């Protein structure tokens, strides 16, 4: 049967996307920029959580340091502005999930409960309820108003490197180090379906905006998953690229993946076609292992990628508006077939 | 003798544990009401 599928693949054509170039670089923090998150209501400013613990807010247009925020103690591993209500959630290895209010620039409510240094926060899009999960191997669910944990989605057998809150029945996509991913009947307190198509730490996951799917990463492979049924959608061509740290998808089906190699990958989300590799640069003084993109996100526009690299740099990427199907095409896509996943 | 951390205290057990019903300091209701955006 393989030959049929392969033939079908060759028949189809992954569309051309404009490639990328390093538009802006910001040596802002004094640590790794492990978290980056961008305001989805206005597309004006984006904040980034350092290892220093001082999450700093950055205007896009200028690029300048809008303002620092330092309520945490340990590395702010993740943050998440809620477009729904003006609350910047964040989270550190100090186990706090502090909710800032940007109408005041202070912190408002802490969410105590988490046993171990929480790695990720995701706010629920259609509720006043937020999801968080860390080394505890538990994806908790906080009612914001009342600042209690409502429910605790036990299941995972190992730390839980990412999480994504969606509006549907599978309200949580929990991506763990346990070489799994879970979709949850949140109301039930049960994994509705559990995809496991990963050899290694599933340590970079992203919801697609207008598709209702979620890409996940392993050490190399980068599946993309359709979370209605709880079904696979598409294997990718990430066969030689590094350990994926972050995996932010664009509005226009332009799935990003960030390498521990340092190499910025770039995929057509629909197909899997690796339509640009880009070996990143480090700052003059750095060491060659340090060039590692540890964070990433796209704007509302989708025309600016922001990347929290370990060179203490917040690099930003434009799509080339001078590009065509002849002036910089993709990397001449070819499904390899060598006992492959495609 | 005294050993590094490897497999964290997983909140599976803490979930199956019985409630305490104590009243901690910070769980006292602070900022009851939420804010919202224009939209």
């Amino acid at each position: 049967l393989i030959v049929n599928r392969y033939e079908k693949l060759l028949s189809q054509r992954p569309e051309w996307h404009a490639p990328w170039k390093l538009s802006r670089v910001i040596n802002g923090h004094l640590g790794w920029v492990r978290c980056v998150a961008i305001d989805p209501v206005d597309n004006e400013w984006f904040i980034t959580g350092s290892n220093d613990t001082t999450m700093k807010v950055w205007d896009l247009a200028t690029g300048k340091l809008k303002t620092t925020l330092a309520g945490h103690v340990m590395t702010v591993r993740d943050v998440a502005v809620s477009d729904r209500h003006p609350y910047l959630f964040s989270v550190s290895e100090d186990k706090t999930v502090k909710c800032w209010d940007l109408e005041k620039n202070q912190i408002i409510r802490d969410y105590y409960g988490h046993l171990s240094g929480v790695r990720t926060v995701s706010i629920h899009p259609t509720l006043d309820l937020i999801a968080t999960a860390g080394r505890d191997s538990v994806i908790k669910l906080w009612d914001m108003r009342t600042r209690i944990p409502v429910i605790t989605l036990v299941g995972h057998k190992g730390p839980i490197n990412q999480v994504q809150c969606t509006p549907v029945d599978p309200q949580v996509v929990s991506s763990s180090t346990d070489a799994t991913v879970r979709l949850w009947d949140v109301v039930a307190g049960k994994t509705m379906k559990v995809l496991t198509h990963h050899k290694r730490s599933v340590r970079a996951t992203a919801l697609h905006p207008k598709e209702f799917s979620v890409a996940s990463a392993c050490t190399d492979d980068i599946r993309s998953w359709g979370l209605a049924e709880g079904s696979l959608l598409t294997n990718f061509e990430s066969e030689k690229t590094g350990i994926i740290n972050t995996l932010s998808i664009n509005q226009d089906d332009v799935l990003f993946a960030g390498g521990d190699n340092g190499v910025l990958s770039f995929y057509d989300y629909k197909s899997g076609h690796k339509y640009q590799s880009l070996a990143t640069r480090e700052m003059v003084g750095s060491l060659e292992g340090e060039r590692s993109v540890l964070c990433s996100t796209f704007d509302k526009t989708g025309l600016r990628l922001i990347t929290g690299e370990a060179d203490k740099s917040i690099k930003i990427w434009k799509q080339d508006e001078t590009a065509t199907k002849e002036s910089e095409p993709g990397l001449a896509w070819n499904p390899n077939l060598s006992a492959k996943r495609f | 003798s005294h050993r590094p951390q490897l497999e964290a205290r997983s909140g599976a057990k803490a979930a199956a544990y019985t409630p305490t019903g104590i009243e901690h300091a910070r769980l006292l209701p602070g900022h009851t009401t939420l804010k919202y955006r224009k939209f």
Binding site: S23, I26, G63, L65, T67, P86, E103, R281 | -
Partner: peptide, 29 residues
Amino acid sequence: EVEVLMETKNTQSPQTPLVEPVTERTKLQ
């Protein structure tokens, strides 16, 4: 990189001095 179109910025201080909010309180007049 002093030559290239990559525009580097070694920022330090805040523009808005932790008073000017990041989002503004919408209201009646």
